[PDB]
Design a protein around this ligand. Structure first.
Ligand SMILES: [Mg+2]
Ligand SMILES: [Mg+2]
Ligand SMILES: [Mg+2]
Ligand SMILES: [Mg+2]
Length: 195
RNA sequence: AACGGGGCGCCGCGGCCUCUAGUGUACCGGUUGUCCGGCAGGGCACUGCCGGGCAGCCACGCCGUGGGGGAUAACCGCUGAA
């Protein structure tokens, strides 16, 4: 369905400064400064109009179809996430699961390593991005903290995908006669705010 | 069973001749029948035949022959509205 005018307003929280800048004919750059840090996002080639109105960020479209109109609600979700990112932070929690070979997980500098995954002599090594803090709690839990939800969630997804083999290395999920198979790995259990 | 680690091949490609092998009517030796009077030396038997064999060529011999980056496919995920 066609749309003539649509509008979405996002409420800026206390202590959070937003700078919406135009870097092209339809290109934006949004910098969000908070107590927890500074977030910078790009919105390139967008029909959505971004503007600041007295403590609010204004999103509007004009002559918009369904494809363009749904980008108002998407950008409200993104902008809210960046506000919470610099006011409360994000914490993604992972649980380590194994059956016979315990998975020695350690954080060495900016590298994350996992040992003995299924007894493999090989090592899993993941570079930790800047602005992402990785900690190993106990032997069984991992927490990723940061102010960017996309960057924290992306790294937490790459840890889980590390312990998921593909091709002919993939073990059977179910055991003999329908039982639980060899399911060992690191799984994202959920997310939370640092504060 | 697997990942990861170490070692080597086969097929192909590109070179090389130190070794080994082949050839080597350059060369050296042995020997048959006959002719040059005999010895010596030699012609011919289409290198007469047999053995060895430098160089050159050559393989049946030796040498080299890799990992990475990007955008991607099938697809797997993050965030994420309509
Ligand atoms: Mg000969
Ligand atoms: Mg004589
Ligand atoms: Mg004569
Ligand atoms: Mg002759």
């Amino acid at each position: 369905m066609h749309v003539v005018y649509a509008v979405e307003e996002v409420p800026i929280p206390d202590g959070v400064k937003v700078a919406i800048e135009k870097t092209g004919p339809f290109d934006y750059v949004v910098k969000v400064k908070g107590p927890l840090g500074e977030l910078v996002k790009e919105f390139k080639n967008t029909p959505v109009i971004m503007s600041l109105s007295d403590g609010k960020v204004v999103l509007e479209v004009l002559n918009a179809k369904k494809r363009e109109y749904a980008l108002l609600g998407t950008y409200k979700g993104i902008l809210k996430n960046m506000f919470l990112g610099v006011t409360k932070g994000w914490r993604y929690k992972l649980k380590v699961i194994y059956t016979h070979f315990p998975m020695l997980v350690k954080v060495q500098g900016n590298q994350l390593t996992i040992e003995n995954f299924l007894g493999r002599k090989s090592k899993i090594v993941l570079e930790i991005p800047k602005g992402v803090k990785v900690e190993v709690k106990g032997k069984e839990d991992i927490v990723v903290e940061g102010i960017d939800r996309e960057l924290v969630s992306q790294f937490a997804a790459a840890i889980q995908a590390a312990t998921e083999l593909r091709g002919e290395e993939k073990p059977s999920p179910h055991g003999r006669e329908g039982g639980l198979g060899v399911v060992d790995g690191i799984y994202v259990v959920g997310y939370e705010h640092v504060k």
